[PDB]
């Protein structure tokens, strides 16, 4: 479902519905969302 990044590893963690937020190689309880799939356009001015 949703993939987060272990704030220490950066490893992809597939947390599910109502599961403790923890890193499975790094036990870290802080993870980050991943960059959206939407199109990102910036003008260079």
């Amino acid at each position: 479902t949703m993939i987060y990044l272990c704030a220490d590893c950066g490893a992809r963690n597939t947390i599910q519905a109502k599961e403790v937020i923890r890193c499975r190689e790094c036990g870290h309880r802080v993870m980050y969302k991943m960059r959206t799939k939407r199109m990102v356009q910036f003008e260079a001015r």
Partner: peptide
């Protein structure tokens, strides 16, 4: 204390 702090910081993954 410095050595103990170093030990605790480096192994935070193992000690977790």
């Amino acid at each position: 204390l410095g050595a103990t702090n170093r030990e605790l910081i480096n192994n935070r993954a193992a000690n977790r």
